[PDB]
Amino acid sequence: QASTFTNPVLWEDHPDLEVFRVGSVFYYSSSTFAYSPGAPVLKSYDLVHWTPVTHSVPRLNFGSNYDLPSGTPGAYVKGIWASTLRYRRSNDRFYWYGCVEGRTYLWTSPGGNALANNGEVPPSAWNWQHTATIDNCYYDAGLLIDDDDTMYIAYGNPTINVAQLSPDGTRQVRVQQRVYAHPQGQTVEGARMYKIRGNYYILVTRPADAEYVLRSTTGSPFGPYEARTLVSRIQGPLANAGFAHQGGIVDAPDGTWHYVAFMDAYPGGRIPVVAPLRWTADGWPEVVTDSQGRWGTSYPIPVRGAKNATEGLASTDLDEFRGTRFSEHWEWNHNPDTSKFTLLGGNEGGLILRTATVTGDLFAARNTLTRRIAGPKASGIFRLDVRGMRDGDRAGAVLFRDRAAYIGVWKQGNEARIVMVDDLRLNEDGWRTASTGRVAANGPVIDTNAQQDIWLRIDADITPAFGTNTERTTTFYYSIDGGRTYTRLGPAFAMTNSWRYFTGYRFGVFNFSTKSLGGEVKVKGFKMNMIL
Helix, strand or coil: CCCCCECCCCCCCCCCCEEEEEEEEEEEEECCCCCCEEEEEEEEECCCCEEEEEEECCCCCCCCCHHHHCCCCCCCCEEEEEEEEEEECCCCEEEEEEECCCCCEEEEEEECCCCCCCCCCCHHHCCCCCEECCCCCCCCCCECCCCCCCCEEEEECCEEEEEEEECCCCCEEEEEEEEECCCCCCEEEEEEEEEEEEEEEEEEECCEEEEEEEEEEECCCCCEEEEEEECCCCCCCCCCCCCEEEEEEEECCCCEEEEEEEEEECCCCCCEEEEEEEEECCEEECCCCCCCCCCCCEECCCCCCCCCCCCCCCCCCCCCCCCCCCCCCCECCCCCCCCCCCEEECCCCCCEEEECEECHHHHHHCEEEECCCCCCEEEEEEEEEEECCCCCEEEEEEEEEEEEEEEEEEEEEEEEEEEEEEEEEEEECCCEEEEEEEEEEEEEEEHHHHHHHEEEEEEECCCCCCCCCCCCCCEEECCCCCCCCCCECCCEEEECCCCCCCCCCCCEEEEECCCCCEEEEEEEEEEECCCC
């Protein structure tokens, strides 16, 4: 058995993390902006091996922009920002709170008696429902369920506030403003709140390079709070990925604490790293560094020999869209038009994407289905049947972000042709479309037999390059011999290192029309291979 682990623990974009433990299970909640479903939950038995198990927000309920009714700016880079999740033992219910455009939304799910089953939730038990809307802006919320079952939320920017909730968690009953302000006027945010051995602690970030630990000086959850540095511009564990910051702390079954932070590993996104904590005699947590004062590239494993938790498909497992619902790896760009896709299900599987939007702009198209890229290098392959495309349809495999490119098929009259398109751009100023794309290369006309089984492959390099002037490249390929041989199409595509869109690069499949609705493609399957 492995006795150590290496950082990062998961090389996939899961930002604004919250972590906690129920029995033997660790849970991890991340932010997802306008991707739908939102607010994924991952589980691990050891803080190292994570698997996605549910989403707290099955359809984004924050207004009609989230349905992408009429093109950009839609709700791009709005939606779910840093939010919070905890498990309530007393009623066996998970509570997810997230502030979206000035209001805070509560989504809850029963836990299938998790408290009594060592923290396990049966897959069939998850059932997330919109439970309340609180008309308070809990920006960068951190929920605490206190030992007496009173619920508190720390929040704010650039100073921290603490609100007390009603017993059912649906309204605010008390608030203390400005429980912490930095004495040199520095901005703090990213609150996570804890009750630990009789005391209240709040973890906050100084964006985007430091984490401070606050502790209540009075013993009251309303503070006031004083601060110590947890990390500040710490080196490691990865180069060209900004600094470890934000995240949260959690204890293992053996009682040892750990700090789970994330790095700005653009162009891949923001990815978790883990370090042990020790506690000073006066009750402050400190990061255990390597012998050189760095966040270690490797540490002892927090929990040893724990079977991984194969609850559904792994990130790199072939997915032929079998059974009743999407695996937890998939999220749509904005809420999907549910009338325009079909998960066929059963042993054969297959996903039908009927065109949902008439547009010349990929960023305006409904029903683009996306998933995270695993780093540092990965190949995403989609296998399609495109015989059902109609005149004016465009469909394919997209490397999806604010600067995007795809390999796809364009159906014009009775001609289906493979194309590579680049220069698909959203303006960072307001997220309106800047460019609807350039056909960088034409591939072959494909006959009906090739249309029946076309494989489109994206080789993405997400090796961190944040804060450098080196842009990583992605290359595109197609196969019309059943995935045996691939042909490179088009130039290498340079990827942006910008943080402004927040979400990392993703693999996606899209299908829209420039002329009229009616056509469809079938996605037979997707596979991600790690490029070693």
